[PDB]
């Protein structure tokens with residue numbers, strides 16, 4: 097009943113944390129495999145981590161929990177595990193790597209930093225409470241340290257629980273309503289867009305994650321005229337309505353023109369370039385905001401942990417980003433991708449099973 | 458009514474953020490004055506910041522707000538401004554610096570880092586929502602940048618709103634219930650312990666802040682035996698009860714002995730060394746937790762933003778810390794102060810007034 101006692105099921109055909117409505121906090125933990133971590137070792141690793149998530153998400157201490165009193169109040173804690181391209185070579189399982197699971201191709205907007213890119217193994221931990229989250233992260237590292245090195249850890253947040261109603265769209269650190277057009281969990285379009293059905297059999301019921309750390313150049317954004325800001329996106333700042341409508345969820349009319357005959361939503365508006373007509377081909381956007389550090393003279397380092405889930409990186413992610421990589425895409429003046437990683441996310445498990453057992457077992 | 462629409466009054470005899478029950482998130486912003494920032498400039502600065510807090514805490518955009526749509530949902534946003542020792546020399550107001558407002562004396566446990574210590578000007582921003590908080594921080598830096606350089610920014614969190622009931626004690630990242638013995642806002646003991654009445658007149662109705670960034674050596678803490686953990690503190694881990702009682706709020710009996718004649722609460726137990734018999738001399742503890750970064754092999758960098766408020770640093774803070782600085786203080790094995798700063802926090806203001814006007818006006 098409480099924000100603190102509420103739980104998310106750990107077991108199911110799918111891993112939690114994907115269809116789960118985004119919780120208030122997230123940590124994306126990126127791990128590289130140690131020299132001796134092969135197929136057997138990854139099995140022991142995933143069995144450890146599986147049981148940790150199984151207990152902690154239900155508010156129970158992990159086995160050998162160093163802080164058992166931090167286990168209760170799970171606050172909708174979820175774990176989502178993902179396998180990077182390198183994990184299949186280390187496992188001797190190159191035959192099982194999906195064809196599209198590989199570093200994204202270069203984009204003109206890219207300013208990618210190694211310290212925010214790549215990784216053999218992802219542990220994505222989401223939770224409505226940051227103390228519960230912190231404990232879950234320590235326990236993960238307690239069992240992963242023998243097998244892996246920490247490549248990076250990216251921390252993000254959304255609104256605190258209760259600040260806005262459930263399902264209402266939340267704003268990003270540019271002040272924009274962010275998440276209006278999105279596959280809805282528990283619809284035909286969602287399952288077909290998100291859950292893998294083709295390709296190697298182990299991944300069916302899983303998905304893929306494209307995780308891109310995108311900096312917001314807020315100093316430049318601030319000085320941008322507000323009417324220019326709406327022209328660049330294709331929607332109004334306060335209402336979130338498309339420029340052709342009046343309410344946030346009005347459907348963007350990409351054929352409307354104005355008095356002078358010009359498109360109401362501009363040719364390079366961000367919702368035009370990013371739109372895909374076929375809903376079943378769309379990506380699931382499930383981002384978190386980040387805010388990290390200030391320089392001496394007061395420049396912010398903040399932006400978006402852009403988390404995209406799709407059944408097929410080549411069909412559903414790369415074309416959109418390629419289309420965004422154009423010159424007239426005005427949002428590129430104010431955003432800069434500084435990190436890129438891709439992960440194959442296995443199906444869920446039941447009792448007696450473990451995450452990744454279909455691949456590594 | 459909502460966690461998001463709830464507000465804290467900005468105006469009053471005292472600044473908010475001190476007696477205010479701690480909100481879910483905090484940022485402590487440490488600023489050093491630029492070479493040209495004297496008494497007149499500090500007046501313009503404090504008038505800018507005052508009006509920013511006045512509007513933003515009530516869910517209204519600041520003047521020249523770059524992200525006005527991030528102003529609503531204030532979520533109990535508060536600002537607390539503090540003046541460092543150097544601020545009085547730059548203002549030509551050395552006569553008005555409280556005698557005790559100076560860097561803390563050295564302690565044996567100290568491992569102080571310049572990047573977490575000192576500062577001429579504090580902006581402490583607390584809020585139940587991290588997006589609201591982030592916007593408030595950007596607006597603060599927007600108006601402070603011309604006058605100051607950012608020395609440090611320390612970010613901290615407690616439970617999310619709704620995870621525990623109001624007033625229930627929350628745990629720290631060592632799993633300990635933290636905050637049981639504390640002056641209660643709106644009692645004689647609180648007002649006498651917290652609000653300045655003696656010393657220079659401008660500070661009456663204000664207070665002082667001792668802000669110490671204290672790292673938790675969690676790798677060592679984890680390997681410490683649980684019964685040893687309770688012996689070191691003087692209280693039980695799950696219940697929070699003193700070793701002489703059964704419930705969290707039972708009064709510690711510092712005269713009880715066991716069968717063998719030995720003190721039940723040990724001579725160097727952390728609640729014994731830190732206890733002050735006279736409640737009116739106690740400090741107000743209002744800490745935040747921090748969790749920042751992992752090394753390659755999985756060591757955490759986490760701990761406590763220990764925020765202590767008192768009318769008199771020499772009478773109410775330094776003796777306790779000095780008493781904690783002893784050799785048998787076992788908590789010192791697992792905690793390390795890595796940052797120290799002190800601030801004089803002015804009284805509040807009304808409309809037509811501004812924070813610090815009694816000092817700088």
Ligand code: HEM
Nearest residue numbers: 272273274275276277310329367370371372400416417431
């Ligand atoms: C910091 C970077 C970005 C910001 C601030 C941003 C912002 C927005 C905003 C304000 C909207 C309209 C509201 C909504 O429907 O969510 C939107 C829509 C969308 N964005 Fe972005 N976006 C960013 C990056 C990206 C990237 C890299 C992609 C890559 C695929 C992407 C894909 C989409 C899609 C598919 C939509 C839905 C458009 C539609 O069909 O109406 N966004 N974004």
Ligand code: HEM
Nearest residue numbers: 633634635636637638671690728731732733761777778792
């Ligand atoms: C990371 C460092 C620290 C940790 C983990 C810690 C933890 C605790 C715990 C678990 C308690 C008992 C529960 C409570 O009443 O809050 C306590 C009490 C207390 N602590 Fe600490 N503490 C730390 C540092 C400090 C420091 C530096 C001071 C400096 C004055 C201090 C002053 C006090 C006081 C006054 C009490 C109340 C004791 C009583 O009269 O019963 N603590 N602390």
